Each structure stands twice: as structure tokens, then as C-alpha cells.
């Protein structure tokens, strides 16, 4: 009689997985987006008799850090990272997070920032001259040229801080900025250290890694699974309703 | 169901992006025009179940889940680059280099 509960739980988790897939498909064009992997997880109920009821609860692993594809925009301050590079920026709460959205912008007061959040380098957030043109090197050097001044006065005015996370130990926070897991940050320190083995490319921008074939296959599988679970639900309901009349005289 | 109200946001973002592209293509002959480029952002994620214990002498994958919320058009930037110069031979036409605007 309780198989209806297992079937409805499976249906609800299928709906959750469908919602995850729809979320991945919707923002398929945001720059520097990481897809949200998902896979059903089994939980067996047991004890003292005939362990048969095994429930299903959907779960989502961290992400797939497969690099997104690069498109050339020729904008001087667009950065594309290596296989597993990250740019570290302070978040709203004041803590640091990691991202790959290379669409840097400069405010009216010489404040560099990715969308919403300022970029950090040596020390606090990096600041450039008031209206200087900015060029980004292949290793993170920010060269500034004051307008009108002759070209022979290009000066380095700071440096980006680049970290290296392999991917299995980073988890997406509530605002889309990745952070190290508990054990990873315990064993590598609260704040990561800059490394030179990471190179950027100026002028190109990174998209998102969403697989249309994977999305379509998951949608088809979820549709079929949900329909099967619904059929099991209605069969069990009809069986119980027909059998309920035994108590009569 | 959240799927409908997520795909609605996806469709809206796509429609606005198409409108921006159409606007850029419409004024392909407007003098002194700077092209538009629309950038979006994913909404804040909603967590349901926190991840459990990990690396406990086992090779299990994490168990936590968090559903998305959709995508919103966050900004639209105009590329203030340098365009080409067309010769009109009219004595009262001015083409400005570098950066600057007439008040």
C-alpha cells in the first residue's frame, strides 16, 4: 500500500531533475557559466523484515568544469583563462569567491570590477588611474596608458590574482560564485595563493558549457520515467480501491 | 511548477537579445553609431539539502542539491571603439578621432 509513496517520491525527484535541466538550458548564453550536473540517488529503507522499499532522492554534484568556448570580441579588457583557471573577486558578504566571467569593467573612479563585484589582486581591490586605457598581459599585468600622453609612458599599475582549482573540491555558493569545500580549504588554507602557471588571453570571452544533446536526452528520460511512475501510481490506487470492499458484509 | 517560470525567463532573455541584435542591424548606416552588446546573469540559487560527509575513507560523490532560478538581462554595453571614415566632400562635416563628444 505504501508503494504509492515511493512512486510519488520518484516522480517529485524527476520533476526536480527536470527543473535543474531547465535552469541549465535557460542561461545557456551567460558568459562564464558552469553547468549543474545531476544524478538520481537511491536511499534504501530497511529493518527487521524484507528490505524492499528503496526510495529515490535527486542530487546534484558540484559542476562540470569543462572550459567554455571562446569568442573573439577584440575588446582590450576581456580575459579567457586556461583549462582550470579562476579569477578571485570579493563577494557581497566580504568573503572571496572564484569565477570565470571575464567581462571586466572600469568604473568612473578607476575601480576595476567584474559584474557587481570588484576584482582583487596584490592586497585589496586593484585601482587604475582615473581615465587610463588598460591592457591585460598574458600573466595578469595591468598596463595603463594615460590618454594624450605619448605612448612611451605605459606603466604597470597592478596585477590580477589567479588561483588554480581542479574542480572536484569547489561548490557553487548561493550567488553563483564558487568556493572551496570545507576539507579543501582546511588542507589548502582559507585563502589560496597566486601561481604563475596560469596564463590568460586578452580580447576573447568565454561562454558556457551546456551540452544540448545531454539536455535533450535527460528531458526524454525524465518524461518517460515520470509517466511510468504515474502509471504505477494509478494502478496501485485502483488496486487498493477495489480491494477496500473486503470489510463489507 | 518552477520549470515553466524558469523557461519563461529564458524565452524573455532570448527575445530581448534578439531585439538588441535587430536594433544593431537596423542602423548599419547611421553615422557615428556604437554597437550594443547584451550581457545576462544567472539568478541566485536555492539550496534544498546541504552536502554530507566527504572523503570518509570512501569515494562517494557529493549529495547536496540546489535548484536554479533562471536568467535575467543584467546589462547592455556600447562598444566605444573607432569606426571607419567615409568621405563626403561636404565642407561642414567633422570626424573626430580618439575619444570625445561635442557638447
Amino acid at each position: 500500500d505504501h508503494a504509492i509513496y515511493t512512486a510519488m517520491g520518484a516522480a517529485s525527484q524527476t520533476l526536480n531533475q527536470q527543473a535543474v535541466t531547465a535552469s541549465n538550458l535557460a542561461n545557456a548564453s551567460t558568459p562564464g557559466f558552469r553547468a549543474q550536473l545531476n544524478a538520481l540517488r537511491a536511499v534504501p529503507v530497511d529493518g527487521l523484515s524484507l528490505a524492499t522499499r528503496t526510495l529515490v532522492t535527486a542530487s546534484t554534484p558540484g559542476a562540470d568544469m569543462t572550459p567554455g568556448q571562446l569568442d573573439y570580441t577584440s575588446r582590450p579588457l576581456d580575459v579567457a583563462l586556461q583549462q582550470d583557471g579562476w579569477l578571485v573577486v570579493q563577494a557581497a558578504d566580504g568573503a572571496e569567491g572564484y569565477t570565470r566571467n571575464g567581462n571586466i569593467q572600469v568604473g568612473p573612479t578607476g575601480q576595476l570590477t567584474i559584474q557587481g563585484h570588484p576584482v582583487i589582486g596584490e592586497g585589496g581591490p586593484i585601482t587604475v588611474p582615473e581615465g587610463s586605457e588598460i591592457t591585460i598581459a598574458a600573466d595578469g599585468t595591468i598596463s595603463a596608458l594615460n590618454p594624450g600622453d605619448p605612448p612611451n609612458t605605459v606603466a604597470p599599475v597592478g596585477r590580477l590574482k589567479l588561483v588554480k582549482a581542479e574542480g572536484n573540491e569547489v561548490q557553487r555558493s548561493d550567488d553563483g560564485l564558487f568556493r572551496l569545500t570545507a576539507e579543501a580549504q582546511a588542507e589548502r588554507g582559507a585563502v589560496l595563493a597566486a601561481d604563475p602557471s596560469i596564463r590568460i588571453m586578452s580580447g576573447v570571452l568565454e561562454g558556457s558549457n551546456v551540452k544540448p544533446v545531454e539536455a535533450m536526452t535527460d528531458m526524454i528520460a525524465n518524461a518517460r520515467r515520470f509517466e511510468m511512475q504515474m502509471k504505477v501510481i494509478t494502478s496501485v490506487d485502483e488496486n487498493e480501491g477495489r480491494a477496500n470492499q473486503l470489510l463489507s458484509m | 511548477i518552477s520549470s515553466l517560470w524558469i523557461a519563461k525567463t529564458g524565452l524573455d532573455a532570448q527575445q530581448t537579445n534578439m531585439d538588441v541584435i535587430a536594433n544593431n542591424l537596423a542602423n548599419v548606416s547611421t553615422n557615428g553609431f556604437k554597437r550594443q552588446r547584451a550581457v545576462f546573469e544567472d539568478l541566485l540559487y536555492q539550496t534544498i539539502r546541504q552536502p554530507g560527509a566527504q572523503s570518509s575513507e570512501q569515494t562517494t560523490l557529493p549529495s547536496g542539491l540546489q535548484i536554479g532560478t533562471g536568467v535575467r538581462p543584467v546589462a547592455t554595453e556600447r562598444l566605444h571603439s573607432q569606426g571607419n571614415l567615409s568621405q563626403t566632400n561636404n565642407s561642414k562635416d567633422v570626424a573626430i578621432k580618439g575619444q570625445g563628444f561635442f557638447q
Binding site: 536511499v43 529503507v45 530497511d46 529493518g47 523484515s49 | 560527509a53 570518509s56 562517494t60
Partner: peptide, 21 residues
């Protein structure tokens, strides 16, 4: 005891954990 029979001790609670520690 065999299923469906009588017993003098209550069954232990059911847990069904997501992932064992």
C-alpha cells in the same frame, strides 16, 4: 519472528539515511 506473526518486542525505528558517515 516470521512476517505476519505475533511478537513481544517492538520493531526498531526505520532510518533510511541519505549517506552513511
Amino acid at each position: 519472528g516470521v512476517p505476519g506473526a505475533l511478537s513481544n518486542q517492538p520493531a526498531p525505528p526505520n532510518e533510511a539515511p541519505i549517506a552513511t558517515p
